[PDB]
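Annual report, structural modelling task.

Input specification for the magnesium ion complex:
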Amino acid sequence: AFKPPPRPDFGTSGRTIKLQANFFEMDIPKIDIYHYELDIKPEKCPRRVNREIVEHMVQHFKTQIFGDRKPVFDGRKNLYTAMPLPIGRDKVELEVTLPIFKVSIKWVSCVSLQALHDALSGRLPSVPFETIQALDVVMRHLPSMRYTPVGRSFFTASEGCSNPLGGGREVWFGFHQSVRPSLWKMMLNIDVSATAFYKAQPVIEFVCEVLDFKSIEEQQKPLTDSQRVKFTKEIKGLKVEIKRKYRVCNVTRRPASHQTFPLCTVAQYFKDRHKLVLRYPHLPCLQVGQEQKHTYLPLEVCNIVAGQRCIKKLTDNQTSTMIRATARSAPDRQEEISKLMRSADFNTDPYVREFGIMVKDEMTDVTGRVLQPPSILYGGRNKAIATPVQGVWDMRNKQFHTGIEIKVWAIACFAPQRQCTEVHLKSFTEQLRKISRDAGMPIQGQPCFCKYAQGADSVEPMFRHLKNTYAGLQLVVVILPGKTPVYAEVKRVGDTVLGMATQCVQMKNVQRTTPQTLSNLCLKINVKLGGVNNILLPQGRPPVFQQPVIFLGADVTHPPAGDGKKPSIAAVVGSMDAHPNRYCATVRVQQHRQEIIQDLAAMVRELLIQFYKSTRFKPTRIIFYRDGVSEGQFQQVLHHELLAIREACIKLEKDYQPGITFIVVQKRHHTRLFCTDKNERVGKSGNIPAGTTVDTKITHPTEFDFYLCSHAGIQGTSRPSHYHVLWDDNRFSSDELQILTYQLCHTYVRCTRSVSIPAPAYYAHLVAFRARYHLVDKEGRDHQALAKAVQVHQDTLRTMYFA
RNA sequence: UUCACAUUGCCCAAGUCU
RNA sequence: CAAUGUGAC
Ligand SMILES: [Mg+2]
Ligand SMILES: [Mg+2]
Ligand SMILES: [Mg+2]
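The model returned the following structure:
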């Protein structure tokens, strides 16, 4: 349960496409570099302070140490040199004074860059991480002090333009940077990005932006409690400067004119000690430093210090502004990356140059293949076949594979009658039934119940009424006035309390209908009621389908930024037929920000039991698409989850030992692919076509991984989903697994489109997000309560309630 | 809460010294 | 999924 399998072979399927990748070839010398351990007393210091004290150390001790110029530093305890120092293994004790630190330098090892060549060149079977790490510290050294680091990125205020967001916020532009091995050479992966920062401005102006003042002196009265509290919400925890830098822990209730402390008042303290007649004595003070102490600063002598990222959620308007400032077509993104690289000129970086590293200033050429889509089999009399083109098809003149006959259905309208009238409801009903009939999901007559209601309180009694009164009720259609707490209450009651199918619809989509919205609505309804919308052309499926096989999708979704106690949510779904089309779901709450799926063995067990009850087959193979695990987590996640899958098999039966293929799906990474030739660009966004596959050149040097961009790019630059096989009892070839993966992206029931990840992984998200909806404002005994809230009713268990 | 795509929010990463 | 865009007939 540990070593990922070797790349079995290379894919051959599909016509070829010329692509460029945002990977830049690196020439690394075949030489040793030297590793040194450091430690800085005191070590509570931020990473950036350490880099300063080490920089001053290098220039200061230039002569009795560090004669061999230009070491690089990782911000804590690791230092590299291109040539060795006059150190020996002997520690060395040094003192440095920062404008008072002791630092010791112990040698630790060499890092043979020659061995890295070999690990890339099939000589060595494993890629030496420590060597990659060292190169990464080299490449990051200068920009970590020149710009503001944020994760694997770097940001800066852009020269000559501003992008204010308002509320004291503005857009900074930046780039991602990382060092990757590949089938070819080392790769410098660069991508542009953008994120919100606070403006380095006088706190006074910060006040005026936050409170929506055109200016100060507007007015000269002290702030309302309402104004003061809002300001306090914005600036608490931010850094300010007066030489001196402080973190704001509070805003005082009193103005500086009257705010006092044991020496005296604030206006007068600055008048006497600093000859400062405050221009705005009526305004409060910032509390800074130890919250137990009484260090107060008048607003007027304070600026927001530069380079503080905005952590808090952006407002709706800010968000709008942000989108508008950063939205880029694929060709425009490609050009921005290219521009940025020539601009960056990594080869003039003196530290890169110290280690004799060259970086190519143009994107790597790679060849892709565009896989053929599957054909999609519909039902009805005709049993129509739909042929995807550029990642899209449609249902016009096609009826579902297995369509549900709707005999008994109700409507609850929570939108106000004066806005969503009985006339709207009748027309909507008439249009829906038309579409549903063309779709082969005949809504056989009028609803058995149609009533207005208001408020979350009215939901449960209405639904209890409905469940008790109308035998054979298949659906409640729920009209909502827009965003409302009622939606989450409908799903609480429908999904977990009473076990009743619901389909919510926004009022605007009832008032004004279109065929496409209504048709998409039917796709969800048919599914919710147990129907099969369509299936993969059977004879066009890869060979793996000749034997019972179950397809699992798995995801964990973590709490938002800044959260502290909300659970993370694990979801696992499993196919329940051979098409494969129908899925069932499992879901758990688990520990805050834990990626590993804790209860996975019990989840898979459930899915396997339900698969047998639906199909009367025991799977011979299990295919496990595991979403969202980053590289730095492959081995941890696979050790626990692979064994749990086995555990589930083993505790069911017998030496029931079906082969497992464990695949990590990453939609979010920093690889971007672009059409080399302008005439391959698809649509306004100019993206690579659906089906573009890459498993050469930029992928892993020994393991089994590939990019597949399964979807049509509508806007921006498409994320090519990445697939990495951590385990494979089934010995897929590249072709069969890539084609399987692609084909699974055409089985997603909520649209007649090839989506960006396979359907099982997509459903797992939907399951996790629904649990999250079940926990709204409810997030050992804690654990039990939350577990209970995400638990669907018995009659919901076997359904695609998440669709 | 018709739907997909895309930006952010998510494990690793990053962050924390009068 | 939520905020915001681009689209689907
Ligand atoms: Mg996830
Ligand atoms: Mg961490
Ligand atoms: Mg949206």
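Chain A has 20 helices and 35 strands.
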